[PDB]
């Protein structure tokens, strides 16, 4: 089994795979015309895992058309059959292709085996299986005769325009989510994967094809993000954005889309379904079990180099417990070469270096631990903990997407005030560590708008299908006036 | 309302309607080739309401062909739309064609306006509306990923062969039931109505067409019951009999089908869905409220001249209450012919029943027994006392306004329940206040009636018989 | 009943009501500083029903402030109590203030008593009663111990920013919907009603206060639509637009919001919940019951002068049935001005539509086209034939009693459905008996209307848009 994984790792390690476009079921390689992006191993960047074919404007126009042409036959394919493709894909990934998919995610996105398994096997398969169940319920409408004697049915049609899926590097499973949710509901998709997840994302694509995905239903178009995007957005049939990634990129996409809307480029009001990150917080109350809070903060902050949209990146500590908490944490960190894994690419590496280096010249910051970095072999940034003199310092709010924790120490009596500051100060997740129920209740209420997901004594790292359909009601009347 | 009805009555009365076959959506008239059945007013039998085209062997074959040809487009028509046709027909009958349907049923089947309304408006509409609701539940099947990881859906398909609907004269709504239940579930239908409900049944057919029933889904083929039946049953694609009527006819049909099965002339084992009659009973315990028991018995026995499958026709009275019950009954019958029986053949059978009663020492006509066929087929309410409980008049079905009564010594109530249990009924009723007696009868008579009533007259899932389940299971793991 | 209504009518008629702003529970009058809008009777436009105070920039800012200040005490007020206020208001409107509300709606929006009752009593009450029931389901969330041993609860919180309700003139009930849906879910509201429904809308506001709506939860700020809108949208706490009205105004609002988003002036991405209009269609198949299709079209098109988002305004007739359909329609329209359109600006647009039709060779006025603004804004039912199916009169929304008709060769029914599908509608209807045609249209037109009707006029979960889910997960194991 580990032999099976080793063999998969060696396969991809030995040579560099040419990753093509996949448009209308056909594999399109660079063929002496297209640019090739070299996807390298973030743990070893001299090593090229894949030469990724880059999508031209033409290619993009073709992908859009493919999705348009596949549309009627796709939404007329019964739900049972659309589902079978996705369930079959999930189970092929869990079995037949378990090791290839593991190796691709590990090598390409810089994950160890456990991080990869949780992502590209467990969560991926979970997205597909759960969506099939949820959609199944959705489609379980039966016609009814009403009080008035009218005969009614409701049907969920897909969006009339096509869905553009823009997927991040960090989870193979999110790519599956972004394409599979709309596709299951009878939508067709043009999909631009992250450049640095191309290997695993291509694998997902070929698996969907083997599982019987019809031509053009999903089109895999890696390429320059801005170029590919501007072309997709120029088509009158653009129906929805399905996005997961940075706030800044979303805002750009958003702006570009709204431009089109007001300029009237589009047949419909497009739907923008986007998930961004946040500056997620861990709030430690003086009554907390300190050891549990420390371990949770390490896992929530530093696991996968903090490259999770839910990752903890700011910590609030009561003064009376700061020294013990921080002493504990630094001890465990120093115990656990010196890097838990790479960050994804050079750009992220350089951004984190700027963050670390700027902290040194900033008199309102003090680096308490770490700040190590080394790009000689891979993009390795070590765990770093930075104390801020004031809670409203930019480091307490700027998203770093790296193994960098900013900590503010607050006087014990001002816990309530610190809750108010956090509230008054845009997060996806947040956690309180506490035993005292009065403090928990208080933060629970005061921070209601501060996080969509709130955790009590747990790391802050821990439906949507309806956004890709519209209801159409048909009512028949039998009486004649 | 009454004026609209009178107009409908005068319309059908003024002259005679030519009633055609309807095969594959086309009306087929006698065209000087086919026989005709004159359907007459059973209350005024010189009055011909309709001349009813009679199906030839070739017509029947064309009906069977039409049903087979429409099958795929019909079961492929979405349930929503199949239902809509039946809901529309019910609404058209309840409103637009209310007065015509009432008139056709009243005149053709000898019903008064109240009996007609209950049948051809209310029950008919309820059949369609309730079947649509039940079927919608059946079709509400979502696919599921089992624990084993497989991906399953179940679907109900119609029967593969066609359905032969053979319907009785007595309720227009029963004809609607017999054709509507199979058709709703995507079956196609070859339908031979009763000669003596041709007018109302034809109207039902034309309303179904107006409501959008596609051609050949249901084929209306009145004709000689034996000839039509023999030709229908000759076809290898015969898939089901849907029948309501007499026990003897059912047995005849049943016989013909099974013989066909063993000789191997059918692609499938046909399904036989039949509702026959019964000799339904009222049992009075000495603790009963007598007046209520009397009125319930009058209604249960004599309503529509006893021409209901659920009609009471035998009555068990305790000796201590007999004189009082019978006196009230006779006085009440006196204070009020309630309507005619359906045709001469029924009239003549009933005359024989009454006349034979006069010559039998174990029988005594306590009340009624009058009959007159000079204008319509009129047989008056008749109550005959039998001097033993297993006398043939206590078990033979007469389908007419004749009640046979047996009087038992009060102490023998338990024994009388055994006599009923140990000696073929659709419905039965006990009238009593005493809960011990009610419970004992309830249990002892558990096999003696499908519907048992307590202090109520004995006159007061079938969709699944017309489909077959088919499961699809998909597996994703590769060995 | 009629006497109580007459009294209400004569009250509002006798003189003019000063309609104030209501900001933070206080009535704000023109106080010789603010502009006034004279809301007049559209059936008698010299008659001023109300002088409507017009919000200043400062007033709007105070409205926005009031909404923000009431927010916490409002979303902390238990759902039971928030609901109670809306149920009470519905009941007060249905009973105590029934006649005043009918009169305000009739006089102010040009409705007859029946149209007013359906709108400002029945639908308005239904909105509140159904929202309370739906919301109660949403709030029925119990905490659960998951398999992993964690302890979870989910709660719906309101939007963090305030809601801007912009409501149309045509239904008093729609104003109630636009403010009530967000408020029930714990949002606070800045509400700019239509100038020409100020009287009924103000009454609604005062009834909400009497029913106990706490100050600042909903703020009533009539005024210049552009100035008010621009000031509301200037605020960083703007959280949602709740709008019903015209496509062009929506696009204007939508534009202003998105530009605000990209320039970054909002704390959150505002939600934009808008119901706009359509060019709704009736499609007649040659198999249709013509009389029913005619009456449904008359009702769907001309009821309330076509001033409904779901009004029919384009009609497709088969050539073989055209003469008959149109004859019946014109005869029926003849046998009966049904009421006025809302204001002069609408009257003038409609006059242009009619006059332009006279000069267009591809258009022909088959019936009507009369107008008279001497007393009220009266435009009569008008039927215009277009000689091509993609003529602008087949797609431009007129919101008035004008029907555009295109006649297609019977054989081209399938082609006509494609022409509709491949050429922005809220509702649509097919009239037909033939199930194949109904099914084909049902499927081909699946994207051409959100509500599709079969043999019915085309005039015949939103709560979740005003909340956000927030999950709390508690873990007990210590690492
Ligand atoms: O996490 P993450 O690092 O992948 O987040 P991100 O915002 O960097 O990237 C998310 C996704 O958006 C795409 N993207 C990046 N920049 C873009 C731009 N300027 N315009 C359009 N799309 C763009 C990326 O290729 C990726 O698939
Ligand atoms: C129930 O309902 C019955 C009353 O209805 P009914 O009088 O119309 O009963 P029925 O048995 O006389 O007739 C019912 C149906 O069977 C048909 N039929 C009659 N004789 C047949 C035969 N020999 N072969 C094939 N089909 C035949 C009839 O034409 C009619 O459609 C009662 O007997 C009661 O038990
Ligand atoms: C629906 O309902 C509509 C009818 O209602 P209506 O006539 O009141 O429609 P509408 O679009 O004219 O007006 C609706 C609402 O928007 C407001 N409004 C008008 N112009 C505006 C502007 N330029 N900027 C911001 N707000 C503005 C109105 O005052 C009113 O509250 C139909 O067009 C139909 O499509």
Neighbours of B112 (CB within 10 A): 12
Resolution of the structure, angstroms: 2.2
Whether B255 and B321 share a structural domain: no
- Say whether both A236 and A322 belong to one domain: no
Cα-based angle B373, B375, B381 (whole degrees, multiple of 5): 55
> How many C-beta atoms lie closer than 10 Å to residue A38's C-beta?
13
CB B83 within 8 A of CB B136: yes
- Collapsing DSSP to helix, strand or coil, C386 comes out as strand
- Burial tier of B287 (Cβ tally within 10 Å: 0-12, 13-18, 19+): middle
> How far apart are alpha carbons C458 and C449 in whole angstroms?
10
Question: By what technique were these coordinates determined?
Answer: X-ray
Residue of chain C with shortest Cα separation from A472: C450
| SS3 per residue for C250-265 | HHHHHHHHHHHHHCCC
| Cβ–Cβ gap C433/B212 under 8 Å | yes
The pair of three-digit structure tokens given for residue C226, joined into one six-digit string: 């552009």
Nearest by Cα to A162 from A66, A300, A50: A66
Atom of ligand 2 nearest to the CA of B168: 8
CB C270 within 8 A of CB C96: no
Look at residues C79, C62, C58, C271 and name the one whose alpha carbon lies nearest to residue C160: C271
Count Cβ neighbours within 10 Å for each residue of B210-228 and write b for 16 or more, e otherwise.
bbbbbbbbbbbbbbbbeeb
Q: Active site residue: B18, B123, B210, B275, which one? A: B275
Are the CB atoms for A305 and A343 separated by under 8 Å?
A: yes
B254 CB burial (10 A radius; 0-12, 13-18, 19+) = middle
- Look up the CATH number of the domain holding residue A352: 3.40.309.10
Alpha carbon of C173 to ligand 1 centroid (Å): 45
CA distance A431 to A451: 9
Ligand that comes closest to the CA of residue A229: 1
Contact C277, C396 (CB under 8 A): no
**To the nearest 10°, the Cα dihedral for B115, B118, B121, B127?**
-130
Q: E strands of B205-261, at which residues? A: 218-220, 238-244
Both structure tokens of C396:
């431009």
User: Which residue among C165, C200, C244, C249 is best mutated to probe the pocket of ligand 3, counting the most ligand atoms within 8 A of its Cβ?
Assistant: C249
Q: Which of A84, A139, A142, A144 has the most B C-beta neighbours within 10 Å, making it the best mutation to test the interface with B?
A: A142
Go through chain C and tell me how many residues it has. 479
Are A334 and A218 within one domain? no
- Paired residues of A474 in beta bridges: A153, C452
CA B273 – CA B166 distance, rounded (Å): 11
Q: How far is CA C307 from the centre of its chain?
A: 10
Question: What does the angle CA A97 – CA A99 – CA A185 come to, to the nearest 5 degrees?
Answer: 40
Token code pair at residue A252: 């750009």
H or E element at residue A301: helix A290-302
Q: Does residue C340 share a domain with residue C324?
A: yes
Number of residues in chain A: 481
Residue pairs spanning A and C at CB distance below 8 A: 102
Whether C317 contacts C294, CB under 8 Å: no
Put simply, the answer to whether B81 touches C438 (Cβ < 8 Å) is: yes
- Chain A residues within an 8 Å CB radius of C447: 157, 160
Ligand 2, pocket-test mutation among B60, B245, B340, most atoms within 8 A of CB = B245
Cα B81 to Cα B87: distance, rounded to the nearest angstrom: 10
- Residues C181 and C144 occupy one common structural domain: yes
**Cα separations in angstroms, B437 against B130, B282, B285, B286:** 36, 14, 8, 10
Name the DSSP letter for residue B242. Answer: E
Residues A368 and A230 in one domain: no
- Radius of gyration over alpha carbons of chain B, in Å? 24
B227 within ligand 2 shell (Cβ under 6 A): no
Residues composing chain B: 479
3-state helix, strand, coil split of chain C in percent (to 5) is 45, 25, 30
* B198 and B329 together in one domain: no
Strand partners for B220: B22, B191
| Close Cβ partners of C140 (under 8 Å, ≥ 6 residues apart) | none
Rounded distance between C-alpha atoms, residue A349 and residue B144, angstroms: 46
Furthest-apart CA pair in chain B: how many Å?
85
End-to-end Cα separation, chain C, in angstroms = 74
Q: Tell me which residue of A180, A166, A179, A157 sits closest to A223, measured CA to CA.
A: A166
**Contacts of residue A65, Cβ cutoff 8 Å, sequence gap at least 6:** none
Residue C398 DSSP label:
-
- CA B326 to chain CA mean position, Å: 30
How would DSSP label each residue in C163-199? EEEE--SS-HHHHHHHHHHHHHTT--EEEE--GGGHH
Q: What CATH number corresponds to the domain at position A135?
A: 3.40.605.10
CB of B16 closer than 8 Å to CB of B48: yes
Give strand ranges (E) for B92-188: 144-145, 151-158, 162-166
* Contact between residue A236 and residue A68 where contact means Cβ atoms under 8 Å apart: no
Does residue A339 sit in the same domain as residue A282?
yes
- Residue B347 CB: number of other CB atoms within 10 A? 22
Q: Which CA distances in Å does C178 have to C134, C159, C211?
A: 16, 15, 18
Question: Within 13 Å of residue A350, how many CA atoms lie on the same side as its CB?
Answer: 3
State the total domains in chain C.
Answer: 2
Residues β-bridged to residue B36: B53
Taking the CA of residue B263 and the nearest CA in chain C, the distance in Å comes to 41
Sheet holding B151-158, edge to edge: B144-145, B151-158, B467-474
> How many angstroms separate the Cα of C344 from the Cα of each of B224, C72, C194, C380?
74, 43, 15, 15
Chain B residue with CA closest to A212: the answer is: B476
Question: Which of C213, C5, C190 is CA-nearest to residue C90?
Answer: C213
Does residue A214 sit in helix, strand or coil?
coil
The CA angle C462-C464-C468, to the nearest 5 degrees, is 150
| Nearest residue in chain B measured CA to CA from A84 | B151
Terminal Cα distance for chain A, rounded: 74
Long-range own/partner contacts, residues C289-294 (CB < 8 A, 24 or more apart)? C289/A480, C289/C431, C289/C433, C289/C455, C290/C321, C290/C324, C290/C325, C290/C328, C291/A480, C291/A481, C291/C328, C292/A480, C292/A481, C292/C431, C292/C455, C293/C325, C293/C431, C293/C455, C294/C325, C294/C328, C294/C329, C294/C332
Could you tell me if B48 and B15 are in contact, meaning their C-beta atoms sit under 8 angstroms apart?
Answer: no
Pocket of ligand 3 (CB under 6 A): C 166-170, 192, 194-195, 225-226, 229, 245-246, 249, 252-253, 276-277, 309, 397, 399
A277-309 burial string, b = 16+ CB within 10 Å, else e?
A: bbbbbbbbbbbbbbebbbbbbbebbbbbbbbbb
- Residues in chain B whose beta carbon is closer than 8 A to a beta carbon of chain A? 79-80, 83-84, 87-88, 90-92, 95-96, 129, 132-133, 136-137, 139-140, 142-145, 149, 151, 153, 472, 474, 476-478
Same domain? For A266 and A289 the reply is no
Is A381 within 8 Å of A343 (Cβ atoms)?
Answer: yes
**Terminal Cα-to-Cα distance of chain B (whole angstroms):** 74
How far apart CA C235 and CA C62 sit, in angstroms, is 11
A112 shares its domain with A261 = yes
Output phi, psi for C388, to 5 deg.
-135, 150
Print burial letters for B367-406: b (CB count within 10 Å at least 16), e (below 16).
bbbebeeeebbbbbbbbbbbeebebebbeebbbbbbbbbb
Candidate of C245, C310, C450 to mutate for ligand 3, largest count of ligand atoms within 8 Å of Cβ: C245
Identify all chain B residues contacting C454, using CB atoms and an 8 Å cutoff. Answer: 84
Instruction: Kindly report the number of other CB atoms within 10 A of residue C75's CB atom.
Output: 19
Task: Please report the atom of ligand 3 found closest to the CA of residue C166.
Answer: 31
Q: Using the CB atoms, write b or e for B187-207: b if 16+ within 10 Å.
A: bbbbbbbbbbbbbbbbbbbbb
What's the rounded Cα separation, in Å, for the pair B280 and B165? Answer: 25
Domain that holds residue C475: 1-276+461-479
Q: Which ligand is nearest to the CA of A243?
A: 1
Torsional class of A121: left (φ above 0), alpha (ψ -120 to 50), beta (otherwise): alpha
Measured CA to CA, the distance from residue A97 to residue A454 in angstroms comes to 36
In angstroms, the CA C297 to CA C405 distance is: 11
Cα(C209)–Cα(C23) distance, rounded to whole angstroms? 11
**Same structural domain for residues A323 and A450?**
yes
Tokens at A76, concatenated: 């007329």
Contact C468 A477 (CB under 8 A): no
The alpha carbon torsion through A399, A401, A405, A408 (nearest 10 deg) reads 10
Please report all neighbours of B, defined by 3+ CB atom pairs within 8 A: A, C
Q: What is the rounded distance in angstroms from the CA atom of residue B67 to the CA atom of residue A51?
A: 63
Q: Identify whether residues A272 and A149 lie together within a single domain.
A: yes
**Could you give the CA distance from residue B313 to residue B325 in angstroms, rounded to a whole number?**
16
Contact call for residues C116 and C106 (beta carbons, < 8 A): yes
Contact yes or no for A219/A191 (Cβ under 8 A): yes
């Amino acid at each position: 089994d580990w032999d099976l994984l080793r063999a998969s790792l060696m396969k991809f390690k030995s040579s560099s795979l040419e990753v093509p476009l996949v448009i209308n079921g056909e594999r399109i390689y660079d063929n002496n015309e297209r640019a090739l992006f070299p996807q390298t191993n973030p743990a070893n960047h001299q090593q090229v895992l894949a030469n990724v074919t880059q999508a031209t404007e033409k290619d993009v126009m073709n992908a859009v058309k493919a999705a348009k042409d596949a549309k009627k036959d796709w939404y007329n394919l019964p739900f049972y059959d659309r589902s079978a493709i996705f369930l079959k894909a999930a189970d092929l990934i869990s079995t037949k292709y378990r090791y290839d998919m593991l190796a691709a995610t590990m090598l390409g996105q810089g994950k160890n085996v456990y991080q990869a398994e949780i992502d590209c096997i467990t969560e991926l398969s979970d997205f597909f299986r759960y969506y099939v169940k949820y959609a199944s319920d959705l489609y379980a409408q039966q016609p009814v005769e009403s009080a008035d004697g009218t005969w009614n049915k409701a049907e969920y049609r897909p969006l009339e325009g096509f869905v553009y899926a823009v997927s991040p590097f960090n989870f193979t499973a999110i790519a599956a989510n972004l394409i599979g949710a709309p596709a299951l509901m009878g939508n067709t998709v043009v999909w631009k994967p992250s450049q640095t997840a191309a290997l695993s994302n291509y694998l997902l694509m070929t698996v969907l094809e083997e599982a019987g995905l019809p031509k053009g239903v999903i089109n895999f178009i890696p390429g320059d993000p801005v170029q590919v995007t501007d072309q997709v957005l120029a088509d009158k049939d653009f129906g929805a954005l399905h996005f997961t990634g940075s706030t800044n990129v979303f805002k750009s996409l958003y702006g570009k889309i709204q431009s089109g809307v007001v300029e009237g480029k589009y047949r419909d009001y497009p739907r923008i379904i986007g998930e961004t990150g946040g500056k997620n917080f861990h709030l430690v109350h003086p009554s907390a079990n300190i050891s549990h809070a420390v371990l949770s903060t390490i896992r929530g902050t530093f696991e996968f180099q903090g490259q999770k949209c839910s990752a903890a990146s700011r910590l609030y500590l009561p003064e009376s417990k700061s020294e013990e908490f921080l002493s504990d944490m630094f001890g465990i960190l120093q115990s656990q070469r010196g890097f838990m894994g790479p960050v994804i690419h050079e750009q992220s590496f350089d951004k984190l270096v700027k963050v670390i280096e700027d902290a040194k010249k900033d008199p309102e910051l003090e680096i308490l631990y770490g700040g190590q970095y080394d790009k000689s072999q891979g993009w390795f940034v070590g765990p770093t903990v930075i104390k801020a003199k004031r809670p409203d310092h930019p480091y307490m709010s700027t998203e770093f997407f790296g193994p960098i924790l900013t900590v503010y120490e607050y006087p014990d009596t001002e816990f309530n005030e610190i809750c108010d500051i956090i509230d008054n100060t845009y997060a996806l997740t947040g956690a309180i560590f506490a035993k005292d129920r009065k403090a928990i209740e208080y933060a629970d209420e005061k921070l209601k708008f501060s996080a969509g997901n709130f955790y009590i004594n747990d790391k802050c790292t821990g439906n949507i299908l309806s956004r890709f359909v519209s209801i159409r009601n048909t009512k028949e009347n039998f009486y004649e006036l």
